[PDB]
Every structure is written in structure tokens, then in C-alpha cells.
């Protein structure tokens, strides 16, 4: 169905920025610990290794 | 799992699987789902038959079938697309034909075959599981979908013009409770400036038609009027997802409908070079073959916003739900009937010279746009009304049904296409009397004609004033669109209101000097030379009220149920006609942090303010009164009596119905919403009585604010966004200028 990668390209923009074309960190920031859905995504990116230390 | 639950929606639901019942077991149609062979299987012998007995049109017919397949599950819409088996028989709009070019019930079972093998492989997967393991589950579930066929079949063949336009394969779908996506031109929707609509794309249309740049606007999750959203709300029934009778489609959304005849036959030739765009135009065909309207389609893309929820178990009880109570509507309409006849037997026997001051309805009717409109009435209808009064006979009161036409002498445009207005003399007319009636600075802020109340208020304070003076506004304006729809002229009403307005006015301050009089009356206990004078005082102004016209109604109390309750001396500005700066005055009574509070206060109901607006609107329908009663006696030759009974079955008492709402809320337009919707109920009751025509035409003769929705985006009107609190709109330009409708049963159960 094209209407099922479409909406997905959508939200992929929105978090690039390009549709909401500066207070955009802010908003990122803010939607990061609201969202149920990006934040699965999120949390199985690697760790960069400077923050191994952290262990978070 | 709700994947589950989202895959048989699609599966058993959309590809119209109800189909396959008639010719193979219910054993043989859970094999196809758990065996992809089988299916490239039936395709493969059912082509052979069909290539026979189409032959030379084998090609046109297979591409038609292929292209409505995909509209059945992807949603897309092609060029000339036809919506169900029978236009694919006749292949109309490519070849003329004087009949079926091949069987129709091989045709249909080819198209659902075609659009089963269109699902997702990973769906397709989950119902092979199912079939195989819940044999007892699934044959209840495919058996189910057999009566929601059946239903809706039955209604479809009944007319030849909705059999032809009718969609195959369809399932009701809901939407998120709070969004709301519109579709509105660029240019109108700048002006109004709204902080609550967000532009997700455009419409590029087709190359058919050429109109202005439009635009799609979306709304995120809020809190919306009641009644506005999240039921079809349609007052006439429907097959197939389209009306019965006209064939316009109403189960979805479309941005648009063209009907005019020059404007109708300027697209049809410009279709037969190409079309291209986006969004290409769905064409309604008649009963011969020829095309009467056109319809823009929607991007199924955009669909997606809306966060649509396809629970299988879910939908199916929500359709049936929804054929039980147009079977209701039906029936009503069918006991109507009934009444009309009782009275027209009477009447001949009781006297012969009766009959000649009644209208044959069925027959032969000189206005062409009104004896177009009863061609498309349902034939449900039609059949009840030829068991009665005879073949081709419907016999009603003429003096009656003139009464259900008073609409049209001050309306113009067509409701189908979504352009229905007052004529402009009209609005000149009322424009005027909110003038009179209310105070001048009200007027410019409320009624403005070229900025919304929003642009107009820059203080906190004034914000507060301006969300009061609202609320007797819409009041004062709902009950003129009411009454001129019901019958009573426009001529009347415009030169009664400045005489009405007088006569009340005189009243109150003629009262003042005699209320107080008893005091002096009791202090003169003395020499006769005081109270000679307060004597004839009383008197003679006792009498000036005797001849008044508004005399009957004093009588009965209800005229003067507030206005001995108690007077204030303030309270001589609503008379007089300075309803703003009277608001002024009460709102500068209230502490200095909720005036300054804005547009977040919280009026409290123990103040000033929140009485002040009380009595304003009761002020309100004492004129409406007072009209009512006029045309019940002067042009309509009613007792006394008769008529003051008529008028205490459509008023209420405001003071037994408190707010019941949340606190810490701001809901003081919320509970007025909630007021007016009851006063409507009581008025809807009594039209059944007095008016049994009335109710019959409203739902088979198209007119403003009587049919519901047509399946355009959804407009609000005066009543509907009064209860949001918002302030982007105004009540003299563009939006705003709408009534809700007037349809009797309709607003008995919605």
C-alpha cells in the first residue's frame, strides 16, 4: 500500500526538520520523553562510546 | 490481536467475500483463504467463461474489473471509475449497449477474487491460521456478513438509479474522537485567521474542472460541540453508502458536487480528450446511460491523518445499529402517512365541495424544480402512499402545504451542492433589525461584515463583554431563522419587531409609576386630597395597558412572569435598546482579578453579570412570543385560546435548569448550548400535530437547514461553535450565517 510508506516518510521529516522548516531543539527534546513510539526506535541505537561510562 | 481484528476488517469485510456464499459452501470458501493455488485457480477457468460471452469486449471489461478492485482495498480512484458489477455489465460511458454484455454474477465473483489476491502477503497469512484453527469462530463471523448484504441488497433494487451508483464491498470505518481534517479554498480561510487548522498539502484536482487553489487543514485532538462529530447524522436512508433515490454518495468524504446542467455537459467533453491530476472526478450516471452530476474525489494519502480504526467486531455492531434505526425512520414516515389519509376521508364525507382545496402530490405538478425532487422520492414511500389513496394519488390540504414552502421565496442555491444561502434582499432585512433591537456599538463588533470578532477586542476586559452580549445574540437570531421557515412571511416579521419592541418598552416604564404608588398609597392615610389624586393615578394608567396588543399575553402570566418578579434600575438600558454598554455596566461590578483576567475567568453564578445575561435573553423571547400569537390569530384564524395554548408547548423555564458542569471549568456558553437544544425538542413535538404535512415534505423536498449532511466536510453554524468558546468567526459575513436544521424527527432522536 503507498499510503503505508507514505505516513512514515512523514514522520521521518518532522524529526529531520524539514517540514517544520530556532526553538526546534526544544521541541525535539520535549517530544523525546513524551513519545511511546520513538523512543522504542531510540533505545536500540548503539551507544556512542564516550557515554559508556555511563552505562544509560 | 488487534492485527487480527484489523486483518479480517480488510479480508472478510472489504473484498465483499459475502459473494462467494451463493455459489460455493461455506466449507469451500475457507479452503481459498488457507490455499494460495486455489485462487489463481478460479481465476484461470472463471476468465475462460467470462471471454465467451463478453467476446469482442473482453478487453473493456477486464480492465474495468481490475481497476475497481484496487479501489476496493487501496482506496485509489481511476479515470471513469464504476462502482459496482452492474455498471461494469452495461460498460457505461465507453460502448452504448442495449443490455447486459455478459452475466452478472460471474462478474461480481470475478472482481472479488481479483481484489482478495490485492492484500498484503503478511495479512493473508493471519486468516490461513484462522481458518484452519478456528473453524467454528470464523464460519459465524463469514455467516454474519451474509445479513449486512442481504439488508442492504434489498434496498438497492428498489430503484434503478441508486442500484447503478451503489458501492461494492463496503464496511463503516470511525475516525479519532477530536481531529477534524477540512478541505476549504486559500483565499477564504486567510481571512479568518484561525490558530487551530495547520495546511498539510494542496489540492491539484484534475484537469476536467479548473476552480481557485484549495488546500487540506487538519485540526489536532480538542473538545468539539456535541452532536458535531462521530455519527453519520444523515436524515435520509441510505444502501450501499450512497442515498437512496439520487445515488450521491454519503459514506465518505468527498471535497465537493457538481449538478448544473451547462456545467455538467462543459466537463464531460473536456473528459473525453484526457484527464490528469492527483484527484480525478467521480461521474454519477442516470438511468440510461447519460451523466447528471460529477464529484471530486479525496487523496487516500490524507486519509491517513485521521487515525481511522477498523476493528472488525467493533464495525459490524455499528452497522447493524445504524440499519435498525433507519428502519425506525422508515416506519414513522410510513404511520404519517396513515394520519394524511384518515383526514382527507373525513373531510369528503362529510361534504363533497371539500375537495376542491386539496393538491394531488403524485400527480401532475406545474413547477419544474419541485416535480423534480418528488421523481427522486423513495419508493418505499411511494408504494405506501398507492396502497391508500389509490395508483398515483396523494391528496393533501393546499392551505397546509403552502405553509412547507414559504422557504424558497427568501432562499437561493442548491443544498446537494453545498452553496445554500438567504437571498441578499433577505439579509438586508435582518441585518437591519439587529440594529434596532440591540445597540449600535453591539452591532458593529458582533455584526461585522469584513473582520472577525477576534481582530476586533485588544483588552482583557473587553474580552468579557464580548463573550455575553453573544449569548441573547444567537438567541434573537435562531428564533428569526426558525419562523421564517415554518411558513411565516418575511414581509411580517419586519415591520412587527420596531412595533413589538415599543409596546414592551412603554410597559416597563408605565409600570414603574404604579408599582411604587401602593407605598404612597399606604402613606396617604389621611385627608381624601392625596389620595383623590393617588386613585385616579392608578386608574388611568391601568387602562393604558387594557388596550395594548400584547394585552392576551400579559393575561396569561407568562408576559409578566419576570417582570413583577423584580425591577432594577439599570435594567432600563435592555428596554431602551443599549444592550452593550448595559453589559458594561454589570461587568465592571466584578473583582479586579477575574476582569483582568481575560479570557480565563471563571464566572461565578452568584454574580451580577451571570443574572444580567439571564434576564436579557428571557427579554429575547418575549418578542418571539408575541409574534407567534400575532400570526396564529391574524392569518391563520384561531381563537384566543387556541393560540396561547400553542405557545406554552415550545418555551421553557431557565431557572429549573442549572449548570451541572465540572469546576475549575470554563463552561458558561456550554450550558446555554444545552438550553437551546431543549426548547428545540418541544417545538419538534408540536410541528407532528399541527403540521402533519410539514413533516412529510421536510424529508423528501431538499431545503435549507433540513437535510443533514452530504457528504462534504463538515460546516458548523451559529449554535454548534457558540458552545466551543472560540471567537474567530462573526454573525454578519461568511460562517456564521447558518441555522441548524429544522428536520422534526431528526431532532427528536439526534
Known sequence: NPADRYYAQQKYDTISGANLVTSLLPTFLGLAMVNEELRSIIKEMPVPKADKKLGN | ?750
Open chain 2, 1 to 750: 490481536t488487534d492485527t487480527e481484528w484489523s486483518a479480517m476488517h480488510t479480508g472478510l469485510g472489504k473484498t465483499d467475500l459475502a459473494v462467494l456464499r451463493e455459489t460455493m459452501s461455506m466449507a469451500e470458501i475457507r479452503d481459498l483463504l488457507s490455499s494460495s493455488k486455489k485462487v489463481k485457480d478460479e481465476i484461470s477457468t472463471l476468465e475462460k467463461e467470462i471471454q465467451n460471452q463478453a467476446g469482442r469486449n473482453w478487453n473493456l471489461v477486464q480492465k474495468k474489473s481490475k481497476q475497481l478492485a484496487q479501489y476496493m482495498i487501496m482506496g485509489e480512484v481511476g479515470n471513469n471509475l464504476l462502482r459496482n458489477a452492474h455498471a461494469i455489465s452495461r460498460l457505461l460511458g465507453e460502448r452504448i449497449t442495449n443490455g447486459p454484455v455478459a452475466d452478472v454474477a460471474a462478474i461480481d465473483k470475478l472482481i472479488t477474487l481479483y481484489s482478495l489476491e490485492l492484500m498484503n502477503k503478511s495479512d493473508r497469512d493471519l486468516l490461513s491460521e484462522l481458518a484452519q484453527s478456528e473453524v467454528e469462530g470464523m464460519e459465524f463471523s463469514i455467516a454474519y456478513m451474509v445479513g449486512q448484504r442481504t439488508e442492504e441488497m434489498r434496498k438497492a433494487k428498489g430503484d434503478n438509479r441508486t442500484l447503478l451508483n451503489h458501492f461494492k464491498g463496503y464496511i463503516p470505518v470511525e475516525n479519532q474522537q477530536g481531529v477534524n481534517l477540512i478541505i476549504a479554498d486559500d483565499k477564504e480561510f486567510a481571512k479568518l485567521n484561525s490558530q487551530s487548522f495547520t495546511r498539510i498539502g494542496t489540492y491539484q484536482g484534475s484537469t476536467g474542472f479548473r476552480t481557485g487553489s484549495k488546500g487540506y487543514y487538519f485540526s489536532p485532538v480538542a473538545a468539539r460541540a456535541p452532536y458535531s462529530q462521530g455519527i453519520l447524522q444523515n436524515v435520509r436512508n441510505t444502501a450501499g453508502g450512497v442515498d437512496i433515490g439520487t445515488g450521491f454518495t454519503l459514506g465518505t468524504m468527498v471535497a465537493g458536487r457538481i449538478t448544473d446542467k451547462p456545467t455538467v455537459e462543459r466537463i464531460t467533453k473536456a473528459l473525453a480528450k484526457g484527464e490528469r491530476g492527483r484527484e480525478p472526478l467521480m461521474p454519477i450516471y442516470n438511468s440510461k446511460g447519460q451523466v447528471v452530476a460529477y464529484e471530486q474525489s479525496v487523496d487516500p494519502n490524507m486519509l491517513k491523518h485521521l487515525n481511522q480504526d477498523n476493528h472488525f467486531a467493533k464495525m459490524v455492531g455499528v452497522w447493524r445499529g445504524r440499519q435498525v434505526e433507519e428502519a425506525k425512520a422508515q416506519r414513522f414516515n410510513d404511520i404519517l402517512i396513515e394520519q394524511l389519509h384518515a383526514m382527507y376521508e373525513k373531510d369528503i364525507k362529510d361534504s363533497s365541495a371539500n375537495k376542491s382545496q386539496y393538491v394531488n402530490l403524485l400527480g401532475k405538478i406545474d413547477d419544474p424544480v419541485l416535480a423534480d425532487a418528488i421523481n427522486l422520492m423513495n419508493i418505499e414511500t411511494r408504494h405506501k402512499a398507492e396502497e391508500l389513496f389509490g395508483k398515483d394519488e396523494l391528496w393533501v390540504r393546499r392551505d397546509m402545504l403552502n405553509d412547507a414552502l414559504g422557504y424558497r421565496a427568501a432562499s437561493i442555491g442548491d443544498v446537494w451542492t453545498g452553496n445554500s444561502r438567504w437571498s441578499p434582499s433577505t439579509l438586508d432585512t435582518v441585518k437591519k433589525m439587529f440594529l434596532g433591537a440591540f445597540g449600535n456599538k453591539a452591532y458593529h463588533v458582533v455584526m461585522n461584515a469584513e473582520n472577525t470578532i477576534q481582530n476586533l477586542v485588544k483588552d482583557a476586559k473587553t474580552v468579557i463583554v464580548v463573550k455575553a452580549v453573544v449569548v441573547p445574540a444567537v438567541n434573537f437570531l435562531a428564533n428569526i431563522y426558525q419562523m421564517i421557515g415554518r411558513g411565516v412571511p418575511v414581509k411580517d416579521i419586519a415591520v412587527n419587531i420596531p412595533r413589538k419592541t415599543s409596546e414592551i418598552n412603554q410597559y416597563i416604564k408605565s409600570r414603574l409609576r404604579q408599582i411604587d404608588a401602593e407605598a404612597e398609597l399606604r402613606a396617604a392615610e389621611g385627608n381624601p386630597n392625596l389620595v383623590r389624586k393617588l386613585k385616579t393615578e392608578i386608574q388611568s394608567i391601568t387602562d393604558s395597558h387594557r388596550r395594548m396588543s400584547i394585552w392576551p399575553l400579559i393575561e396569561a402570566g407568562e408576559f409578566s412572569s419576570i417582570a413583577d418578579a423584580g425591577i432594577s434600575r439599570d435594567d432600563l438600558l435592555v428596554a431602551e435598546g443599549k444592550i452593550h454598554e448595559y453589559m458594561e455596566k454589570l461587568a465592571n461590578k466584578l473583582p479586579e482579578k477575574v476582569r483582568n483576567a481575560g479570557r480565563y475567568a471563571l464566572i461565578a453564578k452568584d454574580t451580577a453579570l451571570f443574572q444580567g445575561i439571564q434576564k436579557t435573553v428571557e427579554y429575547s423571547d418575549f418578542i418571539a412570543k408575541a409574534i407567534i400569537y400575532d400570526d396564529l390569530v391574524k392569518r391563520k384564524k384561531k381563537s384566543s385560546s387556541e393560540a396561547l395554548g400553542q405557545v406554552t408547548e415550545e418555551f421553557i423555564n431557565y431557572d429549573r435548569l442549572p449548570g451541572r458542569f465540572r469546576g475549575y471549568m470554563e463552561s458558561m456558553g456550554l450550558m446555554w448550548f444545552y438550553n437551546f437544544k431543549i426548547r428545540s425538542i418541544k417545538v419538534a413535538m408540536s410541528m407532528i400535530r399541527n403540521n402533519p404535512v410539514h413533516s412529510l415534505i421536510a424529508t423528501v423536498v431538499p431545503a435549507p437547514t433540513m437535510f443533514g449532511n452530504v457528504g462534504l466536510p463538515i460546516q458548523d453554524n451559529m449554535l454548534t461553535m457558540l458552545a466551543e468558546g472560540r471567537l474567530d468567526y462573526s454573525l454578519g459575513f461568511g460562517q456564521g450565517l447558518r441555522a441548524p436544521t429544522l428536520n422534526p424527527w431528526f431532532n427528536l432522536t439526534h
